[PDB]
Structure formats: C-alpha cells, structure tokens
Amino acid sequence: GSLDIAVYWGQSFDERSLEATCDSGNYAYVIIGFLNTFGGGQTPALDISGHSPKGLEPQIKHCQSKNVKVLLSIGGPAGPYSLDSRNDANDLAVYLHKNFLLPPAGTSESRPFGNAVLDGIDFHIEHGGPSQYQLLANILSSFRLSGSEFALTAAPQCVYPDPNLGTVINSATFDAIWVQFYNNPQCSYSASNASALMNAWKEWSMKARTDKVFLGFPAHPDAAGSGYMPPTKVKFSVFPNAQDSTKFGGIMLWDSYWDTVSQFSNKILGKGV
C-alpha cells in the first residue's frame, strides 16, 4: 500500500517474459513498447523487439489477473512515426480503439494482441509533435467517455514544457505522466548532484495538469546515455520531497530488460536481491 512502479517492456527479444515481469509483483503498470510506425501513408506497425504479438494475449491477461495494468505505448525513442494530418489522428485513434481497447468485433480487425483488451495508451512521442497529437488525445478521450474505460498516459522528456507533448499535457487529458529524468543532464541526476533533478521535479509536480506524476529513471547505467541514479540515492534524496506532492504517483523504470539484470525495483521496494 505504498510505491507504484511503472515499467516499460518489449525492448529486447531475450528479455524476461511479459507474464514473468508481472509475476515479480514489483509493478503496478507494464507498458508494452512500441507501436513505432504510423502516419504519413504508412500502415501501423509494432516494434516489440521480435516478440510474438499474438503470443502476448495470454500474458497480458495473466498480468491483468494479477492486478497489473497493461498499456500500449505509441511512438518510442525513435521510429518512422508522425501524425501531421487530422486524418492521421482519426485513423490512429480508431485503429487503437478497435484493436486494443475494445473486445473483438466482426472479423476484419487485425487484433495484434488477439482478444486481449488493454488498460490504456501511453504517448511516448519523442519527435515531431505537437503535430496532431492533441486531436489524437481528444478522439481517444472521447472514446474513454463512450465505451470501455481506459487510461491515457504520457512520457515527456524532463524539460518543462515538453516540446512534443507539452500542449497535449496542458489539456489535462492524461491520467498519469512519467517524466524521463534521464538522457538529459540539465534535468536529471548528474555529476553526483540532484539539484537539477529536484528543480525539474518541483516544476513538473506543480505545473503538469495530471493527477499523477511519476519520476522516470534508468534501471541500470547501461539503460540510458546519462541520468542513472542508484536506487539508494533515489530513496534517500528523491522520495522525502516527492512524497510531499499530492501528485506523486511513484516511479517509472526504463526498462524491464535492465531491471531484471540490476534488480533496481527489488532494491527500491526492499525485496531480497
């Protein structure tokens, strides 16, 4: 009844399985990344590091049976995704809704993850935006109000306001955001000094129009170019001030593959290493 951890999954063919990731008991959210191809005349495509999309169906259900929420992340660190036209936004919204956020209907749906129904969509938009991402969020949010309830989340970089997602975050549409306090020395843990990190956190927690702000950290030094902060340091230096915010959601970890190696979340939670 204390720390919620969101974790990205799908980043390595050889990673701990989705079902085993959920079985750790360490995570409140598992975020499958990524639908990294869409927009500009492209057909939608997943890059989930060679994992079988249809094979995820029972694993997603297992996760959900363990009261882990499972999201699909759109965009990702890189990839041929864009959302320049209003039609692109409509198309992506409908595709996501029909294939991932509703039970199957008819026979024409591609159902990448089979008959699984996901708990929401994560906006990990790292280039291009703000584009038509506001319209995409508007249409998905409309669906949130007209059928199955699901979450909308975002993964901005740590400079407030985010260049790709800042305007969409300002609409208050996201249930939660996890800020990437890494690959960005100006707003991350750096030179063994947390001042810039804590200044950035203060701003995000004050200004981000969302009920829950999570702090995103790398799970291992190799998981990001910069910004790794050891788990004892996060507990000691970040948590007392972060917990003073009514918006404190917990932490997000990049990513399950590396967390399996490092046992970062085990250390955060005080579970045996």
Residue numbers in the entry: 1 to 273
From the study:
The XAIP-II and XAIP are two forms of a protein that possess two independent interaction sites and inhibits two structurally unrelated enzymes xylanase GH11 and α- amylase GH13. Because of the presence of an additional α-helix α8' (residues, 255-261) this protein is grouped in the subclass of family 18C proteins (GH18C) of the glycosyl hydrolases (GH 18) family. Hevamine also belongs to glycosyl hydrolase (GH) family 18C and has the characteristic combination of residues Asp125, Glu127 and Tyr183 for chitinase activity whereas the corresponding residues in XAIP-II are His124, Glu126 and Tyr182 indicating a loss of chitinase activity.
We have determined the structure of a new form of xylanase GH11 and α-amylase GH13 inhibitor protein (XAIP-II) at 1.2Ǻ resolution. The two forms, XAIP-II and XAIP show a sequence homology of 87% while 13% sequence variations occur mostly in the regions of ligand binding sites. The plateau line represents the steady state equilibrium phase of the interactions between the inhibitor and the enzymes whereas the decrease in RU from the plateau represents dissociation phase. As seen from Figures 2A and 2B, the dissociation phase is slower in the case of α-amylase than that of xylanase indicating a stronger interaction between XAIP-II and α-amylase GH13 (3.4 × 10-8 M) than that of XAIP-II and xylanase GH11 (4.2 × 10-6 M) as estimated using BIA evaluation software. The presence of Phe13 at the entrance of the channel in XAIP-II obstructs the entry of carbohydrates to the binding site. On the other hand, the presence of inwardly protruding Pro77 in the middle of the inner β-barrel blocks the channel passage right in the middle just before the positions of active site residues. On the other hand, Ala78 in XAIP-II is oriented outwardly from the channel and hence does not exert any effect on the carbohydrate binding channel. The insertion of an extra residue alanine at position 105 in the α3-β4 loop and replacements of His106 by Thr107 and Asn98 by Lys98 reduced both structural and chemical complementarities in XAIP-II with respect to the binding site in xylanase GH11 resulting in the formation of a less number of interactions with xylanase GH11.
